[PDB]
Each structure stands twice: as structure tokens, then as C-alpha cells.
Amino acid sequence: QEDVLAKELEDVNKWGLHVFRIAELSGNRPLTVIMHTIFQERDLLKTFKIPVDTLITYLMTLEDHYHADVAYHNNIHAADVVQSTHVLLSTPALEAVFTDLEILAAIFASAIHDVDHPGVSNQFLINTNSELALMYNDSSVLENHHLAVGFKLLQEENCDIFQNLTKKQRQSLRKMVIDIVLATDMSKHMNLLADLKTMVETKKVTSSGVLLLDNYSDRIQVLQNMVHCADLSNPTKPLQLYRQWTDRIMEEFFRQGDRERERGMEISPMCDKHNASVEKSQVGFIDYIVHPLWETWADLVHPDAQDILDTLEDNREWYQSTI
Amino acid sequence: QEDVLAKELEDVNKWGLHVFRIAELSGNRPLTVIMHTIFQERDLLKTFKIPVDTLITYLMTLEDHYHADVAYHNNIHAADVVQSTHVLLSTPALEAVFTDLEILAAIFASAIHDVDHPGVSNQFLINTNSELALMYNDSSVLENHHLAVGFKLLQEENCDIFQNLTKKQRQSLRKMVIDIVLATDMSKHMNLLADLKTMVETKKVTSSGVLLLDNYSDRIQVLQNMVHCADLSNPTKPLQLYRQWTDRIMEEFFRQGDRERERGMEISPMCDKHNASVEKSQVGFIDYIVHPLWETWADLVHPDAQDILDTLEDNREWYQSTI
Ligand SMILES: CCn1c(=O)c2c(c3ccc(C)nc31)O[C@@](C)(C/C=N/O)C[C@H]2C=C(C)C
Ligand SMILES: CCn1c(=O)c2c(c3ccc(C)nc31)O[C@@](C)(C/C=N/O)C[C@H]2C=C(C)C
Ligand SMILES: [Mg+2]
Ligand SMILES: [Mg+2]
Ligand SMILES: [Zn+2]
Ligand SMILES: [Zn+2]
């Protein structure tokens, strides 16, 4: 009866999980069911003494603060970034290299990293003197808000899934989550990438193949770029998944650019439904953002990202052929 | 008494203005009367078409949101930092350097830079899981809040003192104000001081002897350090002023320390009234913070600030002599 959903969830460790089906089958609860699954799969419930009712309560409360009428930045994208991060943590070239806490931080960060997203960009909120941009002084406006909401919901009744962490564990986790989610701001992508390249060229490895990071500065930079890769992972997924992500982001962009066209603002790139090319935008997005980032990641974890980089370059070739 | 206040306000261009008298003589409105005086002095009402009653209404509303029951971080501190910034802007070595808009930004930023300060530090708000730390993700918690409140109050009835700036002017002013107030976070002090050192070491000057500032980065960095110097200027003031500031910061610190000892927290440095040394903390404050900063600033504007640095060194010696 649920074995449909339970059998899809069987793919939780595979790139290209059937996240849109899992959303439909779970009762529009992909974030809740996928997080629940991923915690079991790595046994985080018993490693950190999380009451299961408390996990589900938090997850469902969290998922509820993702906007169902926002086409891209909703609970499905959160579920997909969670699950993506989860695979990238299990890559050979990085195994047993992060704590149970650093693992908990990256996955919790992925889950909350877009919560309460209103469907419009940081630049839109800035230009419209929004209450959000006023609160956060125009700097990483959305990303600060996702964090603040993600942490605030822990205080709702029976939602504190970190109640049995030590207090310095809670402090360490809190800081890592903030560093990670703030890194999802696209205005930080360029410097985040140069730092990733830097680490790649001066990289160090073991005999079995596993990577050598000695200080927090470098390890959080990897977890940052990791969740950042998961956030920009849509063009690396199988094409039938990627295409649905393209429909959704463009719906959201167009729904934004309409509001910029009433208000009389410059319509943002790719948001003018009357002049944009959906396909050319994907090729540029791949050429200039996704492929530079994922090529560098693939080096860092070489061999491990080749099947992912493979799919990305196929998907790029296909989108180009539609032009 | 209005006569007497008006006489005291003739000293607005002088270091060591008696701000505490002006607080009494103005009916606890030092920030309003000093800001009004300064705007008249620099002719800012005409330059930016600021209606006088709009200015007064904003200043009065902003002053209200400083806590009258907080011994140091109140409207008197705000007026002192405004006035200190006003004098520092008038230094010969900077004549004709900054536009009217940059002058406006620095004075406005000084005015709002501590608004709604609750009398406890950033670390205290972080460690006690405050609503403020939660909103701002433990990063420049107060300084972000001071900015949010200061800009927010412009939208109250008849409070938008910037209503006649161009759009470009408001956008540029807003960014500068944020850059300046975020620089008052003491966690930024070392890097800001290191930058000011470098600038002094590589300093360039026009044929006029005035400091040469090519680009936003150098311009905003000087304005950042200027307001930061004014923020840390109490030990450079005549001793009867300095000593009352010491009484006020130590009272405010001790009360935070009481809250800390109550909660079973470690007491912050200088906040333990059973074990604090008021005199040694002022010597350590000067030696490790205020003199390294003011010595570098004096070098930047040499010789303009020699008398101010002499005073700091005399006051340092005086506090030292009391040990
Ligand atoms: C249409 C192309 N495109 C994007 O332009 C962006 C995508 C994105 C995600 C998926 C797809 C299919 N397409 C995307 O994502 C960003 C908004 C980041 C998303 N965060 O949730 C980053 C954004 C990129 C910028 C503003 C340079
Ligand atoms: C007791 C010595 N002392 C300080 O320690 C500090 C003062 C300060 C201001 C005046 C006097 C007399 N004394 C001060 O100011 C800061 C809190 C900044 C003030 N912002 O309003 C910075 C703070 C310094 C830190 C946390 C290293
Ligand atoms: Mg985001
Ligand atoms: Mg301050
Ligand atoms: Zn995202
Ligand atoms: Zn201050």
C-alpha cells in the first residue's frame, strides 16, 4: 500500500532518486520522509538520542514552512538537496572523513537551506525595500532568513531534535550550519569556487584514495561547496528529472519578472517570459556556473564524480540540441 | 536655560564638547540638539532639502529608541559619537575629500550606530540564545539590529529625512551606512586596524596635502575607521569626560556580569564587580585597543590629531598612576 513509497525510498543513496514520485506518494511530504529515512540509514537517531516523534514533529513543521505555491524553492527542492548532499557525503574519496556531527550539520543545513522562501531573489527583496532586506541590511537576505526560521522552529513544542547533544556540540553544529547555509548565497559562488580550486591544486590523499583535510577552515569549505553543489545539482540528474526542475525554476522566475514589470523595475535576467530562451539559459547556467563548479568537485573526489559529470555533459549536449 | 544650551552648542566643532551638560540642558535630548546643530553647521538641510520638522521628528524618534536605562549605550553615547565624527570629518588632511553624501552617511551612521542597544554584548546575546542572536545568526548581532532599527524609523510618520535624495543617492547612502555601522563590531577591529595600517604605510596625498582616495574601498575604509575611532574616543577626551564614560561602561558591564553570575555562566572580562579592576581595564583598553587605533589614525592625518593623541597618552598615564 505504502510499499510504493517504501520501494522508491529504497533508492535513497542513489543519484537520481525519484523525488517527484516520492513527493506524490508521501502525501506531499518528501522532505519529512527523505530526512527520516536518511537519519535511519546513517543511524543518527540513536547516535544523537533523537526521539523519533520529535524528529517527525520538527520535520513536518519545517516542511510546512516551505511554500507550496512556490514552483521551485519548495519542500521538493529541499528534499532533493538533502538527498543529494547525503550521497556526496558517502563518496569513497570522503568516507569516514566527517564526524557524525559534521554529517548532521550538512544534512540539517540542506533541509533548512531555503525554508520560507517567498519565490523571489535577494535582489528583488533589496530593490523593493522589503521587510526582509530591511531586517538583514541587504546582505544574504534570504539565506539569513532560512537559517533563522530553521533554528527557530526547533523551539516549537517537541521539535528540539538536538535536545540530547552536549552544549558545545550544539554550538559547533549551529556554527557549521550557519557557515554552510550562508555559503548557498550565489553572490559567494565565485570566491567559494576559487577556494575550491585552490584546495584541489594543493590537495593531499591517502593510499586507499581518501582525502586529507587537517583544519576546520578547509573542511567547512568542502561541506560548503558540497551543499552548494547539491543546490546546483539539477543539471547533473537524469534528464527527465532535470527537465522538471527547469520547468519549475522558470515558472518561478517568470512569476517574479511579472511583478518586476508591474512595479516598473528592470526585469531580472531570465524572468521576462516575453523574451527569454529557457534552453539557452540552461546552457549558460551549465557553461558558466554548474560545470565549472562540478568539474572542480570531480577533481577533489576523483574518480568519484565521473558518473555525475558524465550525466551533466550529456544533459548539456541535449539542451544545446534543442536550440 | 535655552540661552545656556545654545551657548554650549557653540562648541560643537571642538573635541571635548561637554555632552553631559548638553544632555541636561536639552532635557535629555543630546542626540537631537547636537544632530540638528551639526546639520545646520554643515548646511545639510539645504543641500539635501531636508524639512526641519522632518529632521526633528526623526531625531526625536531615533533618540527615544535608545534605552534611557542603559548606563553607557544610550543617547548620550550616540550624540558623543556623532559629534566626535563631526570633528574628525573637519580635519585639515581630509578637506574636500568626501562628498556631501559621504559626510551625511558618516554622521547618520554615527547617530544610529547603537540604537536599541539592550546593555549586553554580542557574546552574551549569543550565549543566552536571545531572539536577536537567533535572528542574525550570531554575526554582528547588535550592529545588524542597530541598522535595521535606524533605517526602519525613517518610515514612521514624517520621519523620512532622505525623502528628497535621488534614488541613486539613497542607494549609495544606504550601502555606506551599512558598511560603516557593521565596522563598529569589535570582532572586526583587528582586520580594520590592519587595513588602516597598510593604508598609512602606502598613503598618498594630493598636491594640496590632502589625503588622496581613489575608490570606494579606500573611501569607505577611512569612514569606517573614522566612526570606529569616534566610537572608541572616550579615552582621548578631557579627563572629566573620560572618567564619567568609565563609570558608565563599568556600571553597564557589571550588570551584565550579575546576569551572567546569576545564570551560572562564566563572567565576561571586566564584568565581575567583586573582582574587576576599573583602572587596569582602562589601561589595558588603551594599550591594546584605543592607542593602537588612534596612533594609526593620527599617522593617517598627521599632524592634525597630535593634541588628541597627547590627551590619550596623558589619560593613560593618569589611570596608570592610580595603580
Ligand atoms: C535558469 C537557470 N538557473 C539559475 O539561473 C539559477 C538556479 C537554477 C537552478 C536550477 C535550474 C534548472 N536553473 C537555474 O539556481 C540558483 C537560483 C540557486 C537555487 N537555489 O535554490 C542560482 C540561479 C543562478 C543565478 C542567479 C546565476
Ligand atoms: C572598560 C573598557 N572598555 C571596553 O572594554 C570597551 C569599550 C569601552 C568604551 C568606553 C570605555 C571607557 N571603556 C571601554 O567600548 C566597546 C564596548 C565599544 C563601545 N561601543 O559603544 C569596546 C569595549 C571593548 C572590548 C569588548 C575589548
Ligand atoms: Mg537558496
Ligand atoms: Mg556598538
Ligand atoms: Zn536552494
Ligand atoms: Zn558605540
DSSP string over B224-245: HHHHHHHHT-GGGS-HHHHHHH
Q: Which of B36, B73, B228, B302 does the annotation list as catalytic?
A: B73
Kindly report the number of other CB atoms within 10 A of residue B293's CB atom: 22
N-to-C CA span, chain A? 43
Q: Which long-range contacts link A182-186 to residues 24+ away (Cβ below 8 Å)?
A: A182/A140, A182/A143, A182/A144, A182/A147, A182/B137, A183/A224, A183/A225, A183/A227, A183/A228, A184/A113, A184/A114, A184/A143, A184/A227, A184/A228, A184/A231, A185/A122, A185/A140, A185/A142, A185/A143
Q: How far apart are CA B83 and CA B110, in angstroms?
A: 9
Nearest neighbour of B178 by CB, restricted to A138, A152, A174:
A138
Map grid coordinates 535629555 to a residue.
Answer: B28
User: Cis link prior to B51 (omega < 30° from 0)?
Assistant: no
According to DSSP, residue B159 is labeled -
| CB pair distance less than 8 Å for A134 and B144 | no
Which residues lie closer than 8 Å to B269 by C-beta, 6 or more apart? B281
Gap between the Cα atoms of A180 and A148, Å rounded? 13
Q: Which atom of ligand 1 is nearest to the CA of A242?
A: 12
CA distance B139 to chain A (A): 10
Ligand 3 midpoint to CA B243 (Å): 49
Q: How far is CA B44 from CA B5, B47, B179, in A?
A: 21, 5, 21
Length reported for chain B: 323
- Tell me whether residue A189 is one of the annotated catalytic residues: no
SS3 label, residue B12: coil
Instruction: Give start and end residues of each alpha helix (H) in A159-212.
Output: 167-182, 189-201
Resolution (A): 2.1
Asked if A135 lies within 8 A of B148 by C-beta distance, the reply is yes
- Distance CA(B194)–CA(B187), nearest Å, equals 13
Residues in chain A: 323
Strand partners, A211: A205
Name which residue sits closest to atom 6 of ligand 1, judged by CA: A285
* C-beta of residue B8 within 8 angstroms of C-beta of residue B30: no
- Torsion from C-alpha of B286, B290, B293, B297, nearest 10 degrees: -110
Asked if residue B186 has its Cβ within 6 Å of ligand 2, the reply is yes
Q: CB of B319 closer than 6 A to ligand 2?
A: no
Distance CA B172, CA B115 (A): 21
d(CA B119, CA B109): 19
Listed in sequence order, the DSSP H helices in chain B are 2-8, 19-25, 30-41, 44-47, 52-64, 75-89, 100-112, 122-127, 131-136, 141-152, 167-182, 189-201, 216-231, 239-262, 278-285, 291-300, 306-321
Q: Distance between CA B117 and CA B110 in Å, rounded?
A: 14
**Quick check: B105 and B219 in contact, CB under 8 A?**
no
Measure Cα distances from B131 to A161, A277, B68, B126, B269 in Å. 19, 44, 21, 9, 23
For residues A253 and A270, the answer to whether their CB atoms sit within 8 Å is yes
Q: Are A178 and B138 in contact (CB under 8 A)?
A: yes
**What is the phi/psi pair of residue B49, to 5°?**
50, 50
Closest CA to A244 of A282, A288, A275, A274: A282
Mapped onto helix, strand or coil, the DSSP state of residue B67 is coil
CA distance B319 to B284: 10
Query: d(Cα A124, Cα A114) in Å, to the nearest integer?
Result: 16
Inter-chain CB proximity B138 and A174 less than 8 Å: yes
Q: Which residue, judged by its Cα, is nearest atom 15 of ligand 1?
A: A232
Query: What number of C-beta contacts closer than 8 Å exist between A and B?
Result: 33
Cβ burial, residue B168 (10 Å; 0-12/13-18/19+): exposed
Q: Residue A227 region, left (φ>0) first, then alpha (ψ -120 to 50), else beta?
A: alpha
Nearest-CA neighbor of A89 among A211, A184, A205, A249? A211
What is the chain A residue with the closest CA to B168?
A127
User: Cα B101 vs. chain centroid, distance in angstroms?
Assistant: 18
B282 alpha carbon – ligand 2 mean position (Å): 9
Q: Which residues contact A268 (CB under 8 A, 6 or more apart)?
A: A121, A123, A124, A253, A256, A257, A260
What type of residue sits at position B230? A
Query: How many angstroms separate the CA of residue A140 from the nearest CA in chain B?
Result: 11
The 3-class SS string of A212-270 reads CCCCHHHHHHHHHHHHHHHHCCHHHCCHHHHHHHHHHHHHHHHHHHHHHHHCCCCCCCC
- From CA B74, how far away is CA B126, in angstroms rounded? 21
| Cα–Cα distance measured from residue A63 to residue A75, given in angstroms and rounded to the nearest whole number | 6
**φ and ψ at B13, to 5 degrees?**
-90, 5
Q: Which residues of A touch B138 (CB under 8 A)?
A: 174-175, 178
Q: What sign has the CA pseudo-torsion A258, A259, A265, A271?
A: negative
